[PDB]
Amino acid sequence: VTSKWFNIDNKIVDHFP
Amino acid sequence: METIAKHRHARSSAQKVRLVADLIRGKKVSQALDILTYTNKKAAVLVKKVLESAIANAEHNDGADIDDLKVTKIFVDEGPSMKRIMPRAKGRADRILKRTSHITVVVSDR
Amino acid sequence: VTGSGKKPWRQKGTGRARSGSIKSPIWRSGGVTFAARPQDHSQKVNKKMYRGALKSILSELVRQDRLIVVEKFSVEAPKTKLLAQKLKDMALEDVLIITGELDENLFLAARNLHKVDVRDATGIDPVSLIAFDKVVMTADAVKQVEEMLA
Amino acid sequence: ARVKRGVIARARHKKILKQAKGYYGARSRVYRVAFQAVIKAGQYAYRDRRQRKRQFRQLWIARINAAARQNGISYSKFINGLKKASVEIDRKILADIAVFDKVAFTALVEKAKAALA
Amino acid sequence: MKTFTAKPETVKRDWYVVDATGKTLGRLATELARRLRGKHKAEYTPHVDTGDYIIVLNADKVAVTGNKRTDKVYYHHTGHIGGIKQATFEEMIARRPERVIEIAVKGMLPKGPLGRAMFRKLKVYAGNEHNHAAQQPQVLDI
Amino acid sequence: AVQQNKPTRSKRGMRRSHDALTAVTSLSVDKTSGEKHLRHHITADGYYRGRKVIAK
RNA sequence: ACGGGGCUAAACCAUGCACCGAAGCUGCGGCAGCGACGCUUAUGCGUUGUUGGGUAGGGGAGCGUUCUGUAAGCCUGCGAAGGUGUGCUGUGAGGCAUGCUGGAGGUAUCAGAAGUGCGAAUGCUGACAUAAGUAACGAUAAAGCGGGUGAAAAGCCCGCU
RNA sequence: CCCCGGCGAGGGGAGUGAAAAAGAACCUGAAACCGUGUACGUACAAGCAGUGGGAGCACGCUUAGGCGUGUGACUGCGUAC
Ligand SMILES: N[C@@H](Cc1c[nH]c2ccccc12)C(=O)O
Ligand SMILES: [K+]
Ligand SMILES: [K+]
Ligand SMILES: [K+]
Ligand SMILES: [K+]
Ligand SMILES: [K+]
Ligand SMILES: [K+]
Ligand SMILES: [K+]
Ligand SMILES: [K+]
Ligand SMILES: [K+]
Ligand SMILES: [Mg+2]
Ligand SMILES: [Mg+2]
Ligand SMILES: [Mg+2]
Ligand SMILES: [Mg+2]
Ligand SMILES: [Mg+2]
Ligand SMILES: [Mg+2]
Ligand SMILES: [Mg+2]
Ligand SMILES: [Mg+2]
Ligand SMILES: [Mg+2]
Ligand SMILES: [Mg+2]
Ligand SMILES: [Mg+2]
Ligand SMILES: [Mg+2]
Ligand SMILES: [Mg+2]
Ligand SMILES: [Mg+2]
Ligand SMILES: [Mg+2]
Ligand SMILES: [Mg+2]
Ligand SMILES: [Mg+2]
Ligand SMILES: [Mg+2]
Ligand SMILES: [Mg+2]
Ligand SMILES: [Mg+2]
Ligand SMILES: [Mg+2]
Ligand SMILES: [Mg+2]
Ligand SMILES: [Mg+2]
Ligand SMILES: [Mg+2]
Ligand SMILES: [Mg+2]
Ligand SMILES: [Mg+2]
Ligand SMILES: [Mg+2]
Ligand SMILES: [Mg+2]
Ligand SMILES: [Mg+2]
Ligand SMILES: [Mg+2]
């Protein structure tokens, strides 16, 4: 199955650039 | 003389039948039959048929008296569960358990 | 193992331990890690170590009174009833017969007795000299093993 | 020569769960938790075989101190008097006489006061 | 032979009465904590309550040295945020004088279910009168 | 939100200490039929408080 | 901002004698390693000195499991293997005996060979938990009643709204 | 074959069989997990849940007593792998 969308979403995931 | 009746593979969870079996443990068969008549539970219909069969078994196979029988033992065991599949959202599948029970009622005049 | 070389699921993202093959020895129905092959278990024995060990075995058969020497040992017809009666005549129960040159009557007569093996002087081996309780050698054969063992 | 581990692994697990009887919850039912609690119970038992000797001498000293002050002397002077009077009764027996024979204990206190004076 | 152990069913407890007039607070509290615990008896056992009952009279006339009558502060917190409360030694004597001796002795006793059962044996009164004459307390002169 | 540790079988039975059913205690007798019924309910035979109310 | 209670010493300085205090040292019993000397060994015993925390790692000695020989032997329907209790025993891995279940196999000793020992690897497969009798029961177009059948009818059939 | 039950499911007898707890969900029938019964503890008590000490109770023994088994009030020490 595909992963949870919130784990895909760049805004949520990449929060600490 | 102790007399047994059983209902194996009864379609309901054991936790739901245990609520009704705890109402009639230690009672007289006179008094356990009307407690089950006015309990509004699906498990009270399953337990009353196992209790009526245990009274007929004691009268017919053992020559006992209905007037003096009591519910000495009653216990509900778990039976095999049936595995079903329930579709969830986004293509995920859950496993549904359809739980069964083994109801055992025991009557005796002593 | 029969199957595909396809990676069961992707490397990252699924929250599951990583896999690369359905054939791996960790998995049920997978391969054996160090699977065996047909092998040759034979060893080498030096010639002087093989002949030195037969002389050691033969000297123990005479020290322990397990060696019997006769001049002639044969039966008249190829009948198992004859040999069994003959070994009852010598109180021999579980015996190895070594002859100079094997005669066919004695070989057929002992084929059915499971505690008697009949052999010629050339075909002796170290294990049967220890496995049987008594050993019966014709002196035709006793002198044949001497030149065999120098 | 393939070896199955059924019979040997069952007997080694059953040996650990027999030593974990009386423990609470998964500590008497589950091997991963029982094994780990059977080791800690042997580390405590090794350590407490040394502490049992400390806790009993600490108990004997406190009972000698209480029975000696009933006779008008402290512990630190009762012990010095008995060493001065060459009495070699240990603290396990003194604390035993202090409870069960109070007149034998008074005789020892008088012997310790005479050696100090 | 195993070391004697005091059994809580057959231990004998006695009654005493103490006059707290002019005593130093701390130097009276230590002797109370000895006899409530039972450290003055040869049957002393650390897990059994072998002590005695003690009645303390005139709790409002206990003495302290130095400037401790105005400078000794009692703190407690109510559980609610910002709820730290204080009271000097003079205010505790005026408002609730028995609490001064009970707080002192409570800090000198073991902590746990047994040290709380030892504390139930102390009876502190602010005056010269007690109503435990049926128990026949003996006078304990310090 | 989800648990960090598996609750025990003891904590599960404590929560179900209030799940018990209470049997009915008031089975009344009809004064003409002698039948049992719930109170303020008609009997299985269609009687209530001595009289036949429903002719079924 | 003494660990607390409390303390005008229960603080500090100086002197002195007691006592508490560790797995240190001593006492009693036991085991093992390495030396030295001997009732004499035949490679084991006796006396004595000393040593014995341990990761990475090196060296030594063993237990148990399946299979082959010894074994056409030995045990076993007067109860084998396996399962489950109890007792005894060894420094340990372990061993022995026996009650109950089970209903046909097991295997001494001394050698031989290894798919030879599992708690971890977000290990693999199956079974079973937890959250929990909790959320939810999939369009807010909507139901009510009488009769029928039936063990049982809110949901089926008929009728009228 | 008889009995309860819906001309059910399921069960109790009877009978077969060496055995039916060999009954077709069928040799043996471990563990996790879930129950019923009995003994002891538990509603003023704070924490890796044990370990050292230890009262009381219950059941067995066997005695002119104090051992065995189960439980474990209270107490010293003690932050899993
Ligand atoms: N959150 C939306 C949209 C979405 C689908 N897939 C995604 C992947 C990443 C981010 C958002 C999404 C949904 O669950 O329907
Ligand atoms: K393929
Ligand atoms: K057996
Ligand atoms: K694992
Ligand atoms: K649940
Ligand atoms: K809806
Ligand atoms: K069977
Ligand atoms: K089963
Ligand atoms: K089981
Ligand atoms: K404890
Ligand atoms: Mg959905
Ligand atoms: Mg879809
Ligand atoms: Mg993950
Ligand atoms: Mg394979
Ligand atoms: Mg050659
Ligand atoms: Mg042949
Ligand atoms: Mg300090
Ligand atoms: Mg000293
Ligand atoms: Mg010491
Ligand atoms: Mg020491
Ligand atoms: Mg030392
Ligand atoms: Mg070492
Ligand atoms: Mg073999
Ligand atoms: Mg075996
Ligand atoms: Mg047995
Ligand atoms: Mg392996
Ligand atoms: Mg495992
Ligand atoms: Mg590991
Ligand atoms: Mg399966
Ligand atoms: Mg919830
Ligand atoms: Mg809710
Ligand atoms: Mg809801
Ligand atoms: Mg719908
Ligand atoms: Mg209708
Ligand atoms: Mg039969
Ligand atoms: Mg069979
Ligand atoms: Mg079976
Ligand atoms: Mg209480
Ligand atoms: Mg309180
Ligand atoms: Mg902790």
For chain B, the domains span 1-110
Q: Which residue of A has its CA nearest to C9?
A: A1
| F47 sits in which H/E element | strand F47-48
**Cβ count near C5 (within 10 Å):** 8
Contact flag D99-E40 (C-beta cutoff 8 Å): no
Residues of C in contact with A6 (CB under 8 A): none
How do strand E73-77 and strand E84-88 relate by DSSP bridges?
Answer: antiparallel
Measuring CA to CA, which residue among B18, B10, B4 is closest to residue B75?
Answer: B18
Q: Which residue of B has its CA nearest to F24?
A: B35
Cα(D96)–Cα(D102) distance, integer angstroms: 10
Which homologous superfamily does the CATH classification assign to the domain defined by C1-149? Ribosomal protein L4/L1 (3.40.1370.10)
* Site from B25, B27, B35, B76 to mutate, F interface, most F CB atoms within 10 angstroms: B35
Q: How long is chain E?
A: 142
CB C71 within 8 A of CB C138: yes
What is the DSSP secondary structure assignment for residue E93, as one 8-state letter?
A: H
Cα(C23)–Cα(C25) distance, integer angstroms: 6
Q: Measured in angstroms, what separates residue E41's CA from nucleotide G76's C1'?
A: 70
B14 in contact with nucleic chain H (CB within 7 A): yes
Which ligand 1 atom is at minimum distance from the Cα of A8? 9
First-to-final CA distance of chain B: 7
Q: Measured in angstroms, what separates residue D40's CA from nucleotide G65's C1'?
A: 29
Structure tokens at E73: 């502060």
Structure tokens at C147: 């030149």
What are the residue boundaries of the structural domains of chain F, listed by start?
A: 1-55
CB C110 within 8 A of CB C117: yes
| Identity of residue B84 | R
Sign, CA dihedral E104-E110-E115-E116, equals positive
Cα(B52)–Cα(B103) distance, integer angstroms: 13
Q: Is the CB of A5 under 6 A from ligand 1?
A: yes
Q: Whose CA is nearest to atom 15 of ligand 1?
A: A5
Structure determination technique employed: cryo-EM
| B57 sits in which H/E element | helix B43-60
| Identity of residue C41 | H
DSSP state string for C11-52: SSSSSS---S-TT-TTSTT---TT------------HHHHHH
* Core vs surface per residue E112-129: b (16+ CB within 10 A) or e: eeebeebeebbbbbbeee
Cα(B81)–Cα(C15) distance, integer angstroms: 29
List subunits contacting chain E, requiring 3 or more Cβ pairs under 8 Å: D
CB B71 within 8 A of CB B90: no
Q: Which member of D59, D67, D70 has the closest CB to residue E3? A: D59
Query: Which CATH number applies to B1-110?
Result: 3.90.470.10
How do strand E122-124 and strand E84-88 relate by DSSP bridges?
Answer: unpaired
Cα(B108)–Cα(B62) distance, integer angstroms: 10
Rg (CA), chain B: 17
Is B27 known to sit in a ligand binding site? no
Residue F36 in contact with partner chain B when CB distance is under 8 A: yes
Structure tokens at E55: 């009645």
| Identity of residue E27 | R
What is the DSSP secondary structure assignment for residue F16, as one 8-state letter?
A: G
E115 in contact with nucleic chain H (CB within 7 A): yes
Q: Which residue of C has its CA nearest to A5?
A: C13
Please compute, for residue B93, the number of CA atoms within 13 A of its CA located in the half-sphere on the CB side.
Answer: 5
Q: Measured in angstroms, what separates residue C62's CA from nucleotide G62's C1'?
A: 39
Residue C67: strand pairing partners: C135
Cα(D102)–Cα(E42) distance, integer angstroms: 10
Nucleotide nearest to D15 (CA to C1'): G94
CB C101 within 8 A of CB C120: yes
How do strand E53-57 and strand C116-120 relate by DSSP bridges?
Answer: unpaired
Cα(E54)–Cα(E122) distance, integer angstroms: 5
Nucleotide nearest to B3 (CA to C1'): H12
Task: Using most ligand atoms within 8 A of CB, pick from A2, A3, A4, A5 the residue to mutate for ligand 1.
Answer: A5
Query: Helices in F1-56 by DSSP H: which ranges?
Result: 9-15
Cα(E2)–Cα(D99) distance, integer angstroms: 13
* Cα separations in angstroms, C68 against C72, C90, C95, C142, D117: 12, 11, 10, 10, 103
How do strand F51-52 and strand F47-48 relate by DSSP bridges?
Answer: antiparallel
Cα(F43)–Cα(F40) distance, integer angstroms: 10
Structure tokens at F33: 């039929």
Sign, CA dihedral D31-D35-D41-D44, equals negative
Cα(B107)–Cα(B95) distance, integer angstroms: 39
Structure tokens at D81: 């008097």
Measuring CA to CA, which residue among F54, F56, F52, F49 is closest to residue F30?
Answer: F49
List subunits contacting chain A, requiring 3 or more Cβ pairs under 8 Å: B, C
What is the DSSP secondary structure assignment for residue B102, as one 8-state letter?
A: E
- Residues 30-59 (D) near nucleic chain G, CB < 7 A: 31-33, 35-36, 46-47, 50, 53-54, 57-58
Cα(C104)–Cα(C89) distance, integer angstroms: 21
Please compute, for residue B89, the number of CA atoms within 13 A of its CA located in the half-sphere on the CB side.
Answer: 2
Structure tokens at E16: 């005493």
Residues 22-81 on B with a CB inside 8 Å of F are 22-23, 34-35, 38-39, 41
* Cα separations in angstroms, E74 against E70, E86, E104, E109: 11, 5, 11, 18
| F9 Cβ contact partners less than 8 Å away, ≥ 6 residues apart | none
* Cα separations in angstroms, A10 against A15, C43, C119, F35: 8, 68, 89, 74
Phi, psi for E66 (deg, rounded to 5): 65, -145
Residues 44-83 on E with a CB inside 8 Å of D are 44, 46
Contact flag B19-F27 (C-beta cutoff 8 Å): no
Rg (CA), chain D: 26
Cα(D49)–Cα(D31) distance, integer angstroms: 27
Q: Measured in angstroms, what separates residue C115's CA from nucleotide H78's C1'?
A: 72
How do strand C67-70 and strand C116-120 relate by DSSP bridges?
Answer: unpaired
| Identity of residue E111 | K
Cα(F56)–Cα(F50) distance, integer angstroms: 16
Nearest CA-CA distance, residue A7 and chain C, Å: 9
Angle between helices B43-60 and B29-37 (to 10 degrees): 150
Cα(E117)–Cα(E110) distance, integer angstroms: 10
Cα(F53)–Cα(F32) distance, integer angstroms: 13
Q: Is the CB of A8 under 6 A from ligand 1?
A: yes
Q: Whose CA is nearest to atom 4 of ligand 1?
A: A5
- Residues 26-65 (D) near nucleic chain H, CB < 7 A: 26-27, 29-30, 36-37, 39-41, 44-45, 47-49, 51-52, 55
Query: What is residue C118's three-state secondary structure?
Result: strand
Cα(D34)–Cα(C32) distance, integer angstroms: 33
CB E55 within 8 A of CB E17: yes
How do strand E73-77 and strand C95-99 relate by DSSP bridges?
Answer: unpaired
First-to-final CA distance of chain E: 38
Structure tokens at D39: 């080791």
Structure tokens at C10: 């992707």
* Cα separations in angstroms, E17 against D25, E20, E133, E135, E142: 50, 10, 11, 11, 10
Residues of D in contact with E4 (CB under 8 A): 96, 99-100
Contact flag B39-F24 (C-beta cutoff 8 Å): yes
